[PDB]
Design a protein around this ligand. Structure first.
Ligand SMILES: CC(=O)SCCNC(=O)CCNC(=O)[C@H](O)C(C)(C)COP(=O)(O)OP(=O)(O)OC[C@H]1O[C@@H](n2cnc3c(N)ncnc32)[C@H](O)[C@@H]1OP(=O)(O)O
Ligand SMILES: CC(C)(COP(=O)(O)OP(=O)(O)OC[C@H]1O[C@@H](n2cnc3c(N)ncnc32)[C@H](O)[C@@H]1OP(=O)(O)O)[C@@H](O)C(=O)NCCC(=O)NCCS
Ligand SMILES: CN[C@@H]1[C@@H](O)[C@@H](O[C@@H]2[C@@H](O)[C@H](O[C@H]3OC(CN)=CC[C@H]3N)[C@@H](NC(C)=O)C[C@H]2N)OC[C@]1(C)O
Lengths: 143, 143
Protein backbone atom coordinates (compact mmCIF):
# COMPACT_ATOMS: atom_id res chain seq x y z
CA UNK A 1 0.00 0.00 0.00
CA UNK A 2 2.99 2.37 0.15
CA UNK A 3 4.13 3.29 -3.34
CA UNK A 4 6.24 5.88 -5.10
CA UNK A 5 4.11 8.71 -6.50
CA UNK A 6 4.02 9.27 -10.24
CA UNK A 7 3.56 12.67 -11.88
CA UNK A 8 -0.15 11.95 -12.24
CA UNK A 9 -0.44 11.59 -8.43
CA UNK A 10 0.46 15.25 -7.82
CA UNK A 11 -3.19 16.12 -7.07
CA UNK A 12 -3.50 13.65 -4.19
CA UNK A 13 -0.18 14.77 -2.71
CA UNK A 14 -1.21 18.42 -2.93
CA UNK A 15 -4.56 17.66 -1.27
CA UNK A 16 -2.80 15.95 1.62
CA UNK A 17 -0.32 18.82 2.03
CA UNK A 18 -3.28 21.25 2.03
CA UNK A 19 -4.93 19.13 4.75
CA UNK A 20 -1.70 19.15 6.78
CA UNK A 21 -1.45 22.93 6.59
CA UNK A 22 -5.16 23.36 7.39
CA UNK A 23 -4.78 21.19 10.51
CA UNK A 24 -2.00 23.53 11.69
CA UNK A 25 -3.79 26.77 10.69
CA UNK A 26 -1.04 27.72 8.24
CA UNK A 27 -2.11 29.07 4.83
CA UNK A 28 -0.80 27.55 1.63
CA UNK A 29 0.35 29.20 -1.61
CA UNK A 30 -1.40 28.54 -4.87
CA UNK A 31 0.14 26.00 -7.23
CA UNK A 32 1.00 23.07 -4.95
CA UNK A 33 -0.26 20.53 -7.51
CA UNK A 34 1.66 22.01 -10.46
CA UNK A 35 4.83 22.25 -8.38
CA UNK A 36 4.57 18.67 -7.11
CA UNK A 37 4.08 17.47 -10.70
CA UNK A 38 7.34 19.16 -11.74
CA UNK A 39 9.23 17.98 -8.64
CA UNK A 40 8.17 14.33 -9.03
CA UNK A 41 9.06 14.35 -12.74
CA UNK A 42 12.42 16.12 -12.87
CA UNK A 43 14.06 16.72 -9.49
CA UNK A 44 16.24 14.74 -7.07
CA UNK A 45 13.21 14.12 -4.88
CA UNK A 46 10.35 11.69 -4.43
CA UNK A 47 6.98 11.28 -2.75
CA UNK A 48 5.65 8.15 -1.08
CA UNK A 49 1.90 7.68 -0.78
CA UNK A 50 0.00 5.43 1.63
CA UNK A 51 -3.18 4.96 -0.35
CA UNK A 52 -4.65 8.44 -0.40
CA UNK A 53 -4.37 8.97 3.38
CA UNK A 54 -0.69 9.73 4.00
CA UNK A 55 2.53 10.78 2.34
CA UNK A 56 6.25 11.39 2.75
CA UNK A 57 8.10 13.97 0.67
CA UNK A 58 11.89 13.44 0.47
CA UNK A 59 14.61 15.62 -1.10
CA UNK A 60 18.15 14.49 -1.98
CA UNK A 61 20.95 17.05 -2.02
CA UNK A 62 24.72 16.82 -2.34
CA UNK A 63 27.15 16.43 0.54
CA UNK A 64 30.96 16.40 0.65
CA UNK A 65 30.76 13.77 3.48
CA UNK A 66 29.37 10.95 1.31
CA UNK A 67 29.41 9.69 -2.26
CA UNK A 68 25.64 9.69 -2.11
CA UNK A 69 23.27 12.44 -1.13
CA UNK A 70 21.93 13.67 2.15
CA UNK A 71 18.23 12.99 2.38
CA UNK A 72 15.71 15.28 4.01
CA UNK A 73 12.19 14.18 4.96
CA UNK A 74 10.70 17.57 4.26
CA UNK A 75 7.10 16.48 4.96
CA UNK A 76 5.51 13.46 6.67
CA UNK A 77 1.77 13.37 7.20
CA UNK A 78 -0.90 10.79 7.99
CA UNK A 79 -4.53 11.88 7.96
CA UNK A 80 -5.82 12.24 11.55
CA UNK A 81 -8.39 9.43 11.38
CA UNK A 82 -5.71 6.96 10.24
CA UNK A 83 -3.02 7.65 12.86
CA UNK A 84 -1.74 5.24 15.51
CA UNK A 85 -2.23 2.20 13.27
CA UNK A 86 1.31 1.96 11.86
CA UNK A 87 0.93 4.04 8.68
CA UNK A 88 3.57 6.60 9.69
CA UNK A 89 5.97 3.81 10.71
CA UNK A 90 5.45 2.13 7.34
CA UNK A 91 6.07 5.38 5.45
CA UNK A 92 9.24 6.09 7.42
CA UNK A 93 10.47 2.52 6.92
CA UNK A 94 9.97 2.96 3.18
CA UNK A 95 11.79 6.32 3.30
CA UNK A 96 14.82 4.52 4.72
CA UNK A 97 14.47 1.75 2.10
CA UNK A 98 14.24 4.19 -0.82
CA UNK A 99 17.08 6.45 0.24
CA UNK A 100 19.25 3.34 0.70
CA UNK A 101 18.82 2.68 -3.04
CA UNK A 102 20.50 6.09 -3.54
CA UNK A 103 23.21 5.31 -0.93
CA UNK A 104 22.14 8.34 1.08
CA UNK A 105 24.55 8.96 3.91
CA UNK A 106 22.09 10.52 6.35
CA UNK A 107 18.40 11.35 6.84
CA UNK A 108 17.47 14.75 8.29
CA UNK A 109 14.08 15.97 9.57
CA UNK A 110 13.03 19.37 10.93
CA UNK A 111 10.51 19.22 13.80
CA UNK A 112 8.96 21.82 16.10
CA UNK A 113 9.99 21.41 19.73
CA UNK A 114 6.33 21.61 20.84
CA UNK A 115 5.41 18.63 18.61
CA UNK A 116 6.19 16.03 21.27
CA UNK A 117 4.20 13.25 19.59
CA UNK A 118 6.22 13.61 16.39
CA UNK A 119 9.44 13.90 18.38
CA UNK A 120 8.66 10.68 20.27
CA UNK A 121 7.82 8.95 16.97
CA UNK A 122 11.13 9.97 15.41
CA UNK A 123 13.16 9.06 18.51
CA UNK A 124 11.54 5.65 18.67
CA UNK A 125 12.46 5.06 15.02
CA UNK A 126 16.15 5.86 15.26
CA UNK A 127 16.46 9.61 14.84
CA UNK A 128 18.33 11.88 17.25
CA UNK A 129 18.40 15.58 18.06
CA UNK A 130 21.90 15.22 19.63
CA UNK A 131 25.23 15.75 17.86
CA UNK A 132 28.51 16.06 19.75
CA UNK A 133 26.57 16.33 22.99
CA UNK A 134 24.37 19.24 21.91
CA UNK A 135 20.87 19.66 20.58
CA UNK A 136 20.60 20.72 16.95
CA UNK A 137 18.51 23.75 16.03
CA UNK A 138 17.04 24.92 12.74
CA UNK A 139 17.31 28.61 11.88
CA UNK A 140 15.46 30.07 8.90
CA UNK A 141 14.73 33.24 7.01
CA UNK A 142 11.69 33.35 4.75
CA UNK A 143 12.31 35.28 1.50
CA UNK B 1 36.54 39.96 -2.07
CA UNK B 2 34.02 37.10 -1.90
CA UNK B 3 33.82 34.92 -5.00
CA UNK B 4 31.85 31.91 -6.22
CA UNK B 5 34.18 28.92 -6.18
CA UNK B 6 35.11 27.17 -9.41
CA UNK B 7 36.05 23.52 -9.76
CA UNK B 8 39.70 24.66 -9.66
CA UNK B 9 39.08 25.86 -6.08
CA UNK B 10 38.06 22.42 -4.77
CA UNK B 11 41.36 21.96 -2.95
CA UNK B 12 41.02 25.22 -1.01
CA UNK B 13 37.43 24.44 -0.06
CA UNK B 14 38.42 20.93 1.06
CA UNK B 15 41.27 22.39 3.14
CA UNK B 16 38.94 24.80 4.92
CA UNK B 17 36.33 22.13 5.66
CA UNK B 18 39.07 19.86 7.01
CA UNK B 19 40.32 22.71 9.21
CA UNK B 20 36.78 23.34 10.47
CA UNK B 21 36.28 19.68 11.34
CA UNK B 22 39.69 19.46 12.99
CA UNK B 23 38.99 22.52 15.15
CA UNK B 24 35.73 21.00 16.43
CA UNK B 25 37.08 17.44 16.69
CA UNK B 26 34.50 16.17 14.17
CA UNK B 27 35.24 13.38 11.66
CA UNK B 28 36.84 14.19 8.32
CA UNK B 29 35.83 11.98 5.36
CA UNK B 30 38.27 10.75 2.75
CA UNK B 31 37.95 12.32 -0.68
CA UNK B 32 36.80 15.84 0.20
CA UNK B 33 38.62 17.49 -2.69
CA UNK B 34 37.29 15.13 -5.34
CA UNK B 35 33.75 15.35 -3.96
CA UNK B 36 33.84 19.16 -3.83
CA UNK B 37 35.09 19.19 -7.44
CA UNK B 38 32.02 17.21 -8.48
CA UNK B 39 29.63 19.22 -6.28
CA UNK B 40 30.92 22.59 -7.52
CA UNK B 41 30.47 21.50 -11.12
CA UNK B 42 26.77 20.96 -10.63
CA UNK B 43 23.83 23.23 -10.63
CA UNK B 44 22.23 22.65 -7.21
CA UNK B 45 25.04 23.79 -4.96
CA UNK B 46 27.71 26.43 -4.70
CA UNK B 47 30.55 27.53 -2.48
CA UNK B 48 31.54 31.11 -1.69
CA UNK B 49 35.17 31.80 -0.82
CA UNK B 50 36.59 34.71 1.19
CA UNK B 51 40.12 34.58 -0.18
CA UNK B 52 41.53 31.36 1.23
CA UNK B 53 40.37 32.01 4.80
CA UNK B 54 36.61 31.43 4.84
CA UNK B 55 33.79 29.76 3.00
CA UNK B 56 30.08 29.17 2.75
CA UNK B 57 28.66 25.98 1.22
CA UNK B 58 25.03 26.23 0.05
CA UNK B 59 22.71 23.59 -1.37
CA UNK B 60 19.46 24.12 -3.25
CA UNK B 61 16.57 21.68 -3.23
CA UNK B 62 12.96 21.80 -4.45
CA UNK B 63 9.92 22.80 -2.46
CA UNK B 64 6.21 22.68 -3.36
CA UNK B 65 5.79 26.09 -1.66
CA UNK B 66 7.90 28.20 -4.04
CA UNK B 67 8.83 28.27 -7.70
CA UNK B 68 12.45 28.55 -6.63
CA UNK B 69 14.45 26.34 -4.32
CA UNK B 70 14.87 26.16 -0.59
CA UNK B 71 18.47 27.02 0.16
CA UNK B 72 20.48 25.45 2.96
CA UNK B 73 23.71 26.91 4.34
CA UNK B 74 25.30 23.56 5.06
CA UNK B 75 28.70 24.95 6.22
CA UNK B 76 29.92 28.40 7.19
CA UNK B 77 33.45 28.90 8.46
CA UNK B 78 36.03 31.66 8.91
CA UNK B 79 39.58 30.72 9.89
CA UNK B 80 40.21 31.56 13.58
CA UNK B 81 42.80 34.26 12.91
CA UNK B 82 40.31 36.12 10.68
CA UNK B 83 37.17 36.08 12.84
CA UNK B 84 35.42 39.09 14.37
CA UNK B 85 36.37 41.38 11.48
CA UNK B 86 33.24 41.13 9.31
CA UNK B 87 34.22 38.21 7.06
CA UNK B 88 31.34 35.99 8.18
CA UNK B 89 28.91 38.88 7.79
CA UNK B 90 30.18 39.43 4.23
CA UNK B 91 29.90 35.72 3.40
CA UNK B 92 26.33 35.55 4.70
CA UNK B 93 25.34 38.75 2.83
CA UNK B 94 26.67 37.13 -0.36
CA UNK B 95 24.75 33.93 0.42
CA UNK B 96 21.53 35.96 0.45
CA UNK B 97 22.57 37.76 -2.74
CA UNK B 98 23.35 34.56 -4.61
CA UNK B 99 20.28 32.62 -3.52
CA UNK B 100 18.16 35.64 -4.56
CA UNK B 101 19.51 35.11 -8.09
CA UNK B 102 17.92 31.64 -7.83
CA UNK B 103 14.68 33.11 -6.44
CA UNK B 104 15.11 30.90 -3.37
CA UNK B 105 12.04 31.02 -1.11
CA UNK B 106 13.87 30.44 2.19
CA UNK B 107 17.30 29.94 3.76
CA UNK B 108 17.71 27.20 6.35
CA UNK B 109 20.72 26.62 8.64
CA UNK B 110 21.30 23.87 11.18
CA UNK B 111 23.17 25.12 14.21
CA UNK B 112 24.29 23.37 17.40
CA UNK B 113 22.56 24.86 20.42
CA UNK B 114 25.86 25.13 22.30
CA UNK B 115 27.31 27.45 19.63
CA UNK B 116 25.95 30.57 21.33
CA UNK B 117 28.35 32.92 19.55
CA UNK B 118 27.28 31.58 16.13
CA UNK B 119 23.61 31.76 17.11
CA UNK B 120 24.02 35.42 18.13
CA UNK B 121 25.55 36.03 14.70
CA UNK B 122 22.66 34.42 12.84
CA UNK B 123 20.03 36.20 14.95
CA UNK B 124 21.69 39.57 14.33
CA UNK B 125 21.48 38.87 10.58
CA UNK B 126 17.79 38.00 10.31
CA UNK B 127 17.53 34.28 10.98
CA UNK B 128 15.06 32.87 13.49
CA UNK B 129 14.74 29.61 15.41
CA UNK B 130 11.09 30.33 16.30
CA UNK B 131 7.97 29.29 14.38
CA UNK B 132 4.57 29.92 15.99
CA UNK B 133 6.07 30.25 19.45
CA UNK B 134 8.12 27.02 19.22
CA UNK B 135 11.80 26.42 18.62
CA UNK B 136 12.67 24.36 15.57
CA UNK B 137 14.82 21.22 16.00
CA UNK B 138 16.85 19.05 13.63
CA UNK B 139 16.69 15.27 13.92
CA UNK B 140 19.12 13.02 12.04
CA UNK B 141 20.07 9.43 11.46
CA UNK B 142 23.53 8.66 10.13
CA UNK B 143 23.48 5.78 7.63
C1 LIG C 1 8.69 15.89 8.53
C2 LIG C 1 7.55 16.71 9.07
O1 LIG C 1 6.57 17.01 8.42
S1 LIG C 1 7.83 17.16 10.79
C3 LIG C 1 6.51 16.43 11.84
C4 LIG C 1 5.76 15.24 11.13
N1 LIG C 1 4.31 15.46 10.92
C5 LIG C 1 3.31 15.77 11.89
O2 LIG C 1 3.60 15.91 13.06
C6 LIG C 1 1.93 15.95 11.40
C7 LIG C 1 0.84 15.35 12.25
N2 LIG C 1 1.15 13.97 12.61
C8 LIG C 1 1.12 12.84 11.78
O3 LIG C 1 0.82 13.08 10.60
C9 LIG C 1 1.43 11.52 12.43
O4 LIG C 1 1.20 11.80 13.77
C10 LIG C 1 2.85 10.99 12.25
C11 LIG C 1 3.13 10.98 10.79
C12 LIG C 1 3.90 11.74 13.05
C13 LIG C 1 2.85 9.56 12.76
O5 LIG C 1 1.99 8.86 11.97
P1 LIG C 1 1.13 7.54 12.52
O6 LIG C 1 0.47 6.90 11.35
O7 LIG C 1 0.35 8.06 13.70
O8 LIG C 1 2.23 6.60 13.09
P2 LIG C 1 2.32 5.17 13.73
O9 LIG C 1 0.90 4.73 13.99
O10 LIG C 1 3.19 4.32 12.87
O11 LIG C 1 3.00 5.34 15.18
C14 LIG C 1 2.49 6.22 16.15
C15 LIG C 1 2.09 5.46 17.46
O12 LIG C 1 1.14 4.46 17.14
C16 LIG C 1 1.29 3.34 17.94
N3 LIG C 1 1.37 2.24 16.88
C17 LIG C 1 2.34 2.10 15.88
N4 LIG C 1 2.14 1.05 15.06
C18 LIG C 1 0.94 0.48 15.54
C19 LIG C 1 0.20 -0.64 15.12
N5 LIG C 1 0.65 -1.38 14.03
N6 LIG C 1 -0.96 -1.02 15.75
C20 LIG C 1 -1.32 -0.21 16.82
N7 LIG C 1 -0.72 0.88 17.34
C21 LIG C 1 0.45 1.22 16.66
C22 LIG C 1 2.51 3.55 18.86
O13 LIG C 1 2.02 3.78 20.15
C23 LIG C 1 3.29 4.76 18.16
O14 LIG C 1 3.75 5.58 19.11
P3 LIG C 1 5.50 6.07 19.30
O15 LIG C 1 5.56 7.45 18.69
O16 LIG C 1 5.56 6.04 20.82
O17 LIG C 1 6.16 4.98 18.51
C1 LIG D 1 30.38 31.86 13.22
C2 LIG D 1 31.36 32.55 12.19
C3 LIG D 1 31.15 31.95 10.75
C4 LIG D 1 31.02 34.06 12.14
O1 LIG D 1 32.00 34.69 11.36
P1 LIG D 1 32.72 36.08 11.85
O2 LIG D 1 33.61 36.55 10.72
O3 LIG D 1 33.41 35.90 13.17
O4 LIG D 1 31.40 37.05 11.91
P2 LIG D 1 31.33 38.70 11.91
O5 LIG D 1 32.70 39.31 12.19
O6 LIG D 1 30.67 39.16 10.66
O7 LIG D 1 30.31 38.99 13.20
C5 LIG D 1 30.85 38.80 14.52
C6 LIG D 1 30.19 37.60 15.24
O8 LIG D 1 30.64 36.44 14.85
C7 LIG D 1 30.45 35.42 16.14
N1 LIG D 1 31.70 34.80 16.37
C8 LIG D 1 32.89 35.35 16.40
N2 LIG D 1 33.80 34.39 16.67
C9 LIG D 1 33.14 33.24 16.80
C10 LIG D 1 33.60 32.00 17.06
N3 LIG D 1 34.85 31.28 17.32
N4 LIG D 1 32.77 30.98 17.14
C11 LIG D 1 31.43 31.20 16.96
N5 LIG D 1 30.97 32.44 16.70
C12 LIG D 1 31.83 33.47 16.62
C13 LIG D 1 30.10 36.20 17.16
O9 LIG D 1 28.63 36.28 17.32
C14 LIG D 1 30.53 37.64 16.79
O10 LIG D 1 29.80 38.61 17.36
P3 LIG D 1 30.29 39.43 18.72
O11 LIG D 1 31.11 40.62 18.30
O12 LIG D 1 29.04 39.93 19.41
O13 LIG D 1 31.08 38.51 19.61
C15 LIG D 1 32.86 32.39 12.55
O14 LIG D 1 33.07 32.96 13.82
C16 LIG D 1 33.26 30.92 12.61
O15 LIG D 1 33.61 30.33 11.62
N6 LIG D 1 33.21 30.31 13.96
C17 LIG D 1 33.59 28.89 14.25
C18 LIG D 1 32.78 27.92 13.39
C19 LIG D 1 31.25 28.19 13.50
O16 LIG D 1 30.74 28.34 14.56
N7 LIG D 1 30.45 28.26 12.28
C20 LIG D 1 29.01 28.52 12.38
C21 LIG D 1 28.23 27.22 12.11
S1 LIG D 1 26.84 27.03 13.27
C1 LIG E 1 26.17 13.99 11.15
N1 LIG E 1 25.25 14.88 10.48
C2 LIG E 1 25.81 16.27 10.18
C3 LIG E 1 24.66 17.20 10.20
O1 LIG E 1 24.06 17.24 11.51
C4 LIG E 1 25.10 18.63 9.82
O2 LIG E 1 25.91 19.14 10.80
C5 LIG E 1 25.87 20.55 10.88
C6 LIG E 1 26.82 21.19 9.83
O3 LIG E 1 25.99 21.74 8.82
C7 LIG E 1 27.76 22.28 10.41
O4 LIG E 1 28.84 21.60 11.06
C8 LIG E 1 29.99 22.36 11.15
O5 LIG E 1 29.91 23.24 12.55
C9 LIG E 1 30.54 22.75 13.66
C10 LIG E 1 30.30 23.49 14.98
N2 LIG E 1 29.94 22.54 16.03
C11 LIG E 1 31.18 21.27 13.63
C12 LIG E 1 31.26 20.61 12.38
C13 LIG E 1 31.13 21.61 11.12
N3 LIG E 1 31.16 20.82 9.82
C14 LIG E 1 27.09 23.23 11.42
N4 LIG E 1 26.38 24.24 10.64
C15 LIG E 1 27.04 25.28 9.87
C16 LIG E 1 26.16 26.22 9.08
O6 LIG E 1 28.25 25.42 9.79
C17 LIG E 1 26.13 22.54 12.39
C18 LIG E 1 26.28 21.03 12.28
N5 LIG E 1 25.44 20.37 13.27
O7 LIG E 1 25.81 18.61 8.54
C19 LIG E 1 26.94 17.68 8.50
C20 LIG E 1 26.49 16.26 8.87
C21 LIG E 1 27.76 15.36 8.87
O8 LIG E 1 25.59 15.84 7.88
Amino acid sequence: EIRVAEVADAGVVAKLLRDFNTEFDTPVPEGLEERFAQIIAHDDAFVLLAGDIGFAYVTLRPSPYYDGPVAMLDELYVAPAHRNRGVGTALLQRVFEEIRKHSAGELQINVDEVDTDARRFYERHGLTNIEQGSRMLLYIREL
